[model samples]
Target chain A: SREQTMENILKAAKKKFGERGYEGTSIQEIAKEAKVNVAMASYYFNGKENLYYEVFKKYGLANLPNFLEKNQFNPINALREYLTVFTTHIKENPEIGTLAYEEIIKESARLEKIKPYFIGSFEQLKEILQEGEKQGVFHFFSINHTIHWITSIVLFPKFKKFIDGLVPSGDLVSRIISALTDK
Target chain B: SREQTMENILKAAKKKFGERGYEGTSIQEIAKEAKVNVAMASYYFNGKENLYYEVFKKYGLANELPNFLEKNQFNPINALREYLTVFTTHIKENPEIGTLAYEEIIKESARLEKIKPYFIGSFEQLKEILQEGEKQGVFHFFSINHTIHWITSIVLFPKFKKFIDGLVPGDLVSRIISALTDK
Candidate 1:
């Protein structure tokens, strides 16, 4: 009974949490949305955080954690390839984007738990820039700003509609690649 | 009563829904925002979902985009300049789309298939235009695919977009011309 109840609560939680986000939504609505009454919701799981963690346990990263660990390369081309892989992966499978972004927007700790897999990727990206800096292979206005802008561009299309109900009109993917590679 | 009330509620809903979102907005909140009674929202619209469609009918890009593009005679460069101007004006006049569109793009599961005809359909024409630009030597760039995306994103992004729109150097058409001409 608890197992069934917990599954129902999570299904509701995913939709609600997907829609409004962690801060704005409440467990009561999650219960209602899931079609389960309140006591069942509270009793089945210790709390919201656990439920969120549960959602991630079932479907977050999908071994991206392991992929990051396995790839220990040290080259600028490697960095570019990694970002291409990371971004393309995001493009191909974006439910993870929705779940990740909703949680990330709120700065949830659940996001932090998975940060190393991503941050490890980011540091490698930074190292690529640093290597280029040492070799004079590249230039930047500011590495920090460049990284921020690149990330911003990458995520812009995803969050734009949710945040403001807008979408870019022309040439989305190719545009992103050009911007990232452009001087 | 239902018909007129529907119109009034719809008018209220577009402004509010565009500002917030489905979950972020509420019936009472929309009613209040509309200067109507809470029950009127339910009565006129039949519920939240109907009201949202009504809002889309009233103000979404379904009609306006085509009319705007047509009035400009559907010339791509002419359209591009106007596209830039019209969008900048919209965002400036209503910041809601800026935030809303960003969020929408990230939600890969966000029913883009239905809207792709409207968004990506524009891309084919732009590609035609870019080809023209290349032939006439009006413009030239590698990876036509990526370049198109680059041109589109740079022209559309908010920070750079706002900067482009806000520039006091001259009118936007000229600013775009200037930016392209100088490069």
Candidate 2:
């Protein structure tokens, strides 16, 4: 019953946040949608802000850890795997992408908490870019801009279909890395 | 009085929509923020939906379609780099466009179809530059559509600056141009 209730709360929260965003959706609305008491959401997640963060935590990065593990050493492979995996995950749940863009603008306390989980993935990509530059294999003008470029490619919902089109099957990582490195 | 009231309505609409999203905001709230009678909003923009549309039309890149496209002397790479620079500055000045666009796409309201022209129209310019570059054999991409989306995501999503603060390279856009065009 506890697992079911948590699942219900997350499902409802994802829908509400995706639909109306953080300010628009209320604890009561989510509670009603989940068929649970307002007290239960608070007990399970502390408050609305936490509930919103939990939605991102649940839906946004299911493959990040696995991607990080297998492709940790090779920046090229890591970057590609991260982008392919993350983009596929985000495309399935585009609301998380929208919700993310919304919070990035707001700079709310919730964003502060949400920001930490992403930094590791970003840092890994940053290191890869650095490594590529050092080996003279890639030529990027700025780490920040390049990092943002790759991040946009990976996470932005608008690019989902295009990514799928390019990587319909094998060696998505190579095709993707080539797009940036091939000039 | 007519011009001032219309301006006020648009101003209020942009702020509220940026803060509260489409469903969360109300006509009365916008009217109140504008310090005008609610009926005048109906008279000027016809209703909340049109007023919202007008906000997009006014501030969004749809209106700047010609500006990005007609400067045709430069190579595809130069044109795109310049386009990215100016476009980023415009969206940076009016951060609401990002929020409004994301919200519109997520909601898929009647307004989304209405506003799609603005986004798609501007997007056509990026696509043209990319196509030209690929035709000239100067640019290589895995997918033209994803490249456009990737560029738009980086330029439109302003939150990447937070990462740049700690990261190296003060000239952010310079790096982006180098990465995209220098290959």
Candidate 3:
């Protein structure tokens, strides 16, 4: 019951923090959203700040390397799997997407705590691209640019709405893979 | 003197709105930053909502197109180069505008409708250049929207240039060009 209650509080924290950001959100609001008492929520996490940190620890891209390894490090398949995993992850937990962008741009103290989680995935992505290049399957101009390009697409799904009718509703993951892969 | 006060209020509003966003900022704080009385600031802009709108109207991407086309001639390559150059400079000089516009966009707020017009012209300009390059067989991309997003991400988010490490301006521009142009 305690674990389930903590989960509920964390979920509420993610939603509130993502919408209103760190400075705008309050523990009382988060507790209300979770349907728990403020005292219980605060007792569980100690404070709003730690609750925010715990949200990232629980939901970040820290498990991205696991996805890559599961795909046996096959560059093309791995990349496709990676994008699928990331896209689905963001879709389910859209708050992480919002929080990540806000914290990254602000470079807030929260980002410092969560940077390890982000950088792990980023470095994993770099390895995927590098391995693909080494095998001559991918022909990117620069690894960093490619990473930024792919990461941007995954992290900011709101931008996709701007081009919804402008482009055909093709498979986005395939399109991104083709962009990075050799013709 | 009236013009100067309005400019000062708009500038201060951009800084505050860009940092704290629309809901987080207040007229009193913006007025204090502008070194004007609260009444004066509110009088110049009519209200915080209008002031936020006025920031985009004044400093948003709509103003960059004339000069962007003037230097590019009809060559798609030249146009894209100028596009990157113009946006890079604008984002660097007025980073707050990018942040403000993007924050509004992600939220899909009512303000987004008002803000969309300010950015739509520039996006259309980008589309025309990409279409021209595709027609001329100079640029190769699977999807116009993807290409646009890729280029726009780099242009709008210069902070990532530092985050990705060692990606100098010249190289980034040239690499993006090469990625698009090279088959």
Candidate 4:
């Protein structure tokens, strides 16, 4: 019952927030969708923000923490394929897109709570970058900038409208990866 | 009155949304900041989304923004130059668009349908320009799609956000255009 109820709640929260947005969705809607009472939703998840964090912890940046551990693919290629798959999935589900972009771009007290879930993956990427440096395939000033650049490129294509009438209907995701291959 | 109200609304929206998120910032708050009433806010703009769109419409870069390859558009490189210069100017002048985005859009799951027109409108133009660049053998990049994404993100999300994010020292967006054009 615990597992089943938690699964139902997670699924409901995802759908509610995915279709609407964090601001647009409400716990009541999530509760109704989950077939659970509002109190239970709040009791387990604590609130909307926590529920969102839970979704990401459960599914947002998978395969990232173990990125360095599974170091067999070319970093650039691996990143590209990884992004292609990830961005594709985010495109299908906007909630995934929401969680990814928020973590990368915004600063909030809420963000601190979510950072641990991503820090491990970030370290993995950094380690990979170090590996790339040792092997002479990657080059950058800071591991920090490198990570941000990779993230911005990955998410920007999917979230293009926010820029509005500035970017053309261009394929940005591929272009960012190509930059690495360029110089 | 309309023009003056708009000016005030703009100031308040940018400040408030930049500080809080789009959802976090309210029309009433914007009005309060502007020293206007809610009716006045509505009179000048229909609603939040339209008002948000208006910010871009009013502040978007001048000629050769993105999409360099349109039938009558500027070359990609030249267009890119204009894009960066104008974007920098706009950011310095407004500061809110980037801030609101970081605060709001970055945190939410903006739907594909909601964002489609803006994404295509901007990215398509950039795509065309780059596509033409390849046709003329002027620029050599693989994967036009990826190229567009990276350049836009390389600019840091429309290339409009803070390139260095507080550490670039002088002129937030200067070296960026240089980086892209470095050949």
The lDDT leader among the candidates is 3
lDDT of 3 by residue, A1-183 (tens): 999999999989988998998888899999999999999899999988889989988887766455457777678898888788888988888888777767777878787776665677777678888888998988876786788778777877776655553444578788888777746
> How do the residues A1-183 of candidate 1 rate in per-residue lDDT, one tens digit apiece?
777777778777867776666656788999998888777686677777776666655434334332323444333455456556667755664444465554443345676664443444455555665565555554443454344444544444453332222222544434433444454
Q: Is the docking of candidate 1 incorrect, acceptable, medium or high quality?
A: incorrect
Give a tens-digit lDDT track for model 4, residues A45-123. Answer: 8877888778767656654434444446467655555556556756665666565444345455665666565455455
Better of 1 and 3 by DockQ: 3
lDDT pick, better of 1 and 4: 4
- State the lDDT of candidate 2 residue by residue for A13-128, as single tens digits: 99888877788889999999999999988789999888888887887663345443576556666666667766677678877777766777787777777766566667767777
Which residue runs does candidate 2 get wrong by more than 4 Å? A1-4, A59-81, A91-93, A127-143, A159-175, A181-183, B62-86, B127-146, B161-173, B181-183
Q: Mind sharing the TM-score for model 3?
A: 0.89
Better of 1 and 2 by TM-score: 2
What's the lDDT for residue B56 in model 1?
41
DockQ of 2: 0.42
Using TM-score as the yardstick, the better of models 3 and 4 is 3
True contacts kept of each: 0.22, 0.43, 0.37, 0.07
Q: Best to worst by TM-score, what's the order? A: 3, 2, 4, 1
Off by over 4 Å in 3: A35-40, A64-69, A165-168, B67-70, B135-137, B166-172
Report lDDT per candidate: 0.53, 0.70, 0.79, 0.58
